[PDB]
Amino acid sequence: KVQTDPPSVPICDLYPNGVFPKGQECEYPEEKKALDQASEEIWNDFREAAEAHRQVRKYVMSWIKPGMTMIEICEKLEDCSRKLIKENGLNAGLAFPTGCSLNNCAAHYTPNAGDTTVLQYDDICKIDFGTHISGRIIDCAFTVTFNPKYDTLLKAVKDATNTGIKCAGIDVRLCDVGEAIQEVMESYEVEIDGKTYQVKPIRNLNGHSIGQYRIHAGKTVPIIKGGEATRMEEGEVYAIETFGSTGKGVVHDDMECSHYMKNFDVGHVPIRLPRTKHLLNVINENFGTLAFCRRWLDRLGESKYLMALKNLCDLGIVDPYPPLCDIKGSYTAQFEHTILLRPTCKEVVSRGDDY
Template identity: 75%
Template sequence: MDDEVEAEGEKKKSRRRNKKKETKVDEPESKEKKQTNPPSVPIHELFPTSEYPVGQEVEYDGRMGKQRITSEEKRAIERSKYDDYNDARRAAEAHRQVRKHIQSWVKPGMTMIEICEELERCSRALIGEDGLKAGLAFPTGCSRNNCAAHYTPNAGDPTVLLYDDVTKIDFGTHVNGRIIDCAFTLTFNPKYDKLVEAVRDATNTGIKAAGIDVKLCEVGEAVQEVMESYEVELDGKTYPVKSIRNLNGHSIDAYRIHAGKTVPIVKGGEATMMEENEFYAIETFGSTGRGIVRDDMDTSHYMKNFDAPFVPLRLQASQKLLGTVNKNFGTLAFCKRWLDRLGATKYQMALKDLCDKGILDAYPPLCDIKGCYTAQFEHTIVLRPTCKEIISKGDDY
């Protein structure tokens, strides 16, 4: 009897020991990382398996579309490109979470520098900035009203965001050079809602029209037809919405934001075909003005010419600046604020010298006529062999 009691006691002790062991093993699983508010946890820590959310998948039109989605050959090609897609998806998830934060955080009365620095701080944290392996793909565009693109504040710029502003927030993230180029229009006054709707609709139309073997000019024609079907009433006066004819979307390649093909937003343009596995930034701009932009205001954006020839540099300052650019940005775009952040000083003459020699290209702000308003929406897509993926698609747009 005593032996039976002793044996039963040992069993209970053993069960208790096993229970403790099980509890210890299970503990780490309950400590799954979650995003903070404001966001600060790198995306790769939120997805420990390194499989990032797939964007919106859209079947190609027609009979060929159905054949593509079931083709084993096309699926095999996709598997070989998985790393490229996955890098872009990680960059896209960072973009989505950053813009969600900015959309709820930004308020009239903030300076443009304050807004850009918060957006860039958040982007650097979420993308897990790591030299040229992961980081910001280009400066934060925050072009207001008649200015459509390529404005970011330089140091000391006192510009303040106003309630009546129409601001294009255009920023990019990248992982291993796979760039997400994605933009939205920020407004506070509901009188601009129709303008914003027109451009969002036009961008969605461009995305819908895009596909393998589609001519670029066909995308532009579809965009213009939708964009220019809208009118906007502002302060009792009606304005037609015009596509900005000298702005367009573009193909994207590794570490190359403009990879050679342009996607027009008006009819005409290239009859070149879109091809399998190409990445594109589909972006449209609408204006209540003339629908043409020109260079204006102080330049802030610069980028190394992807095909720049070797040119001997006599100025030591130019050599030093080019070294800084090569090390920190490579062929990705940058701005003066980012040079300041790296501790660069007295670089204005060197910047001009590198631009004059064709090593760097300057990208001044692009503006329509004063008093008009411009809006923009943009997504990055990839023409996968089996379907079209809108990688940067989110709940917001």
Template identity: 70%
Template sequence: MVQGSGFMVHRFKDGSTFRLLLGLFCALTQCLSLNVASRRRPSRRRIFSHSGGLLHRCSFSFLSVKVNSLTLSSFMAEGNSQLNNLVEENGTSELPSHAEGAAELSPPSKKEGDDSKDVSKKKKKKSKSKKKKELIQQTDPPSISVLDLFPSGDFPEGEIQQYKDDNLWRTTSEEKRELERLQKPLYNSVRRAAEVHRQVRRYIKGILKPGMLMTDLCETLENTVRKLISEDGLQAGIAFPTGCSLNWVAAHWTPNSGDKTILQYDDVMKLDFGTHIDGHIIDCAFTVAFNPMFNPLLEASREATNIGIKEAGIDVRLCDVGAAIQEVIESYEVEINGKVYQVKSIRNLNGHSIGRYQIHAGKSVPIVKGGEQTKMEEGEFYAIETFASTGKGYVREDLECSHYMKNFDVGHIPLRLPRAKQLLATINKNFSTLAFCRRYLDRLGETKYLMALKNLCDAGIVQPYPPLCDVKGSYVSQFEHTILLRPTCKEVISKGDDY
């Protein structure tokens, strides 16, 4: 096959036949290009070889035009010259035999440049469509709000667990499904808060290392939360101070301004922080230990939390959840520096129900057997948290206080100190009944407020929450998730790939 004069041509042994056909084809294509008014509807014609074989089966639309013999002769001459050129280029006057195939006449092909232009146009269209479909990716360190990462406004749901036994019918109940559809805005709010928690803790786990100043750690975490949640006063933000309690300190410790505590290799740190949207709180915690000898201690509280979540459900008694948790925790032992310790549940620490702008909504979830006979109810939020200790399994208040929270049901109480009134106004505006710490007041520009803060505590308006500690020298681990008892199923809202 050779290419020339804009045609792909199979050469024939019968050159005269080929010349005739080529000239005729040139004439026909030239007729098509003439701008002549049509007098009749186009007719269909087919061209065949005289040898009986099919030369080229194609259709042409002919216009009714007059083509004189001189014009046809010129077209024939043009065909002869094209064929002679082909023969001269190949250096022979003999054409291949008919066995090579029938002559095929094709319309002029596109130039290579035209093909490349078409391909480039298609690529551009594809690249534009891909750009439109591409989702925004989170930066490192995280700085993009989850609202931008999920432009549809629908956030990932947590882990779904089905109810058991007498509540199994809820899974397929149309009535219960309709109740859930009505609650979709609420569910989406807590899922947004949970997605922020997941992304922040993933980032923090990646940068944690011995030698970090605890104040820097907390401020990095909190500033990341503020960015990702699009902090907006009481509508979206941090739910309570970042707890980073070390070793025998089980809960409620965060550094005050000026604290120089440094994270050590042999520390066991409980990282407990919260997020909220419109007062709907995610309370979630995990434990970090660089030294692998503490792994059994961490595993005790992690597994106990998972068991507590599994046991929880509508109409389940809180004491039954506590019994299941204690059984898991106290099945563990841990060897620390050559000494074996029996792991214990901390009997005076509990999980709790969560309300809107209320971190402790009234119900407690024990982590030991006995206790409350109260049942869990449909629609409730719970923080299922467990504490495993190598100490006595009992905590007391100790160390300098950093956590404070305005009492949820407090009414109007007259205050004499103007500074206390001013501080209360700041608390109401920025925290309402959400917990806060001294660093948060410092960040708002408050100074010399300790006396006024004490006055608010003494008046019963604000409640202090000092650190809770087991015996010195012991180690405590903690894991926690927020769950929602939906009408049809149980959703572990804060669940992630990490725990």
């Protein structure tokens, strides 16, 4: 069987023998082959999630248009993602909420219930969403625009992200990747509405290592120089993402929060407060240590849960991730891919024919 025009066939049903397509395999900048084959089932899970990501985003690009509300966009994307990944509790599903951050806002924004925001012709929207199979997460993102005036800014960030991807590798120092990304990013100048700007990396936003059910495993991939000389290791998985801005090149928390995620290091915590106890149970059952958003709690039939959620945040059990924005009037863009540092090569597992 093949995929229907508007995708609806699970990726696992498109692949009979349970063997999924590899991403772009690259040479780094025998026994290791045996070691690589030993984790084949893991690489395969990443590939299944990546193929779902590729097919979902291809679909999104065909219909996303100004006039649609941000809620309509996210619900349409998420519905497709759930169907192609063949959602099954914590064994297969959405790794995190659909980011659709607009203009000066660079990341971590998704609408909460009631949000009336409508996508505009001049908007620059960062679609950042994730999929996973058995906790093997694909963190991948692109930027959507309708006005050609942002073309060079988008190209700047694409080139910067690919440079970071090419520089990445086993034994490579993280600070070197950041320095490389920055020199490419800043080599671009753009003109938007009569004003010129030297593209600037958003210095306090970074790429990161990825772990099972842990989007932010512990290591950071900076996008500017001056970072840590810590090195990348064999077997690690990384999200290489870069952000370019026409503003200050720095983001701050802004707007209402929609994203939340349980602190991975916090262990079991007995709670007697009834509503707070119930919410934590709902989170443990449906998300575990994966991120979620308010719309996802509404979907599960939960209501009047905001105070319970605040309690979990105040207790440090859950962490809030508010939208991150540059100054008013600035424009930000993002591109991101997930890479596997396999023993025999580097695989840009989420690479597509689109980006």
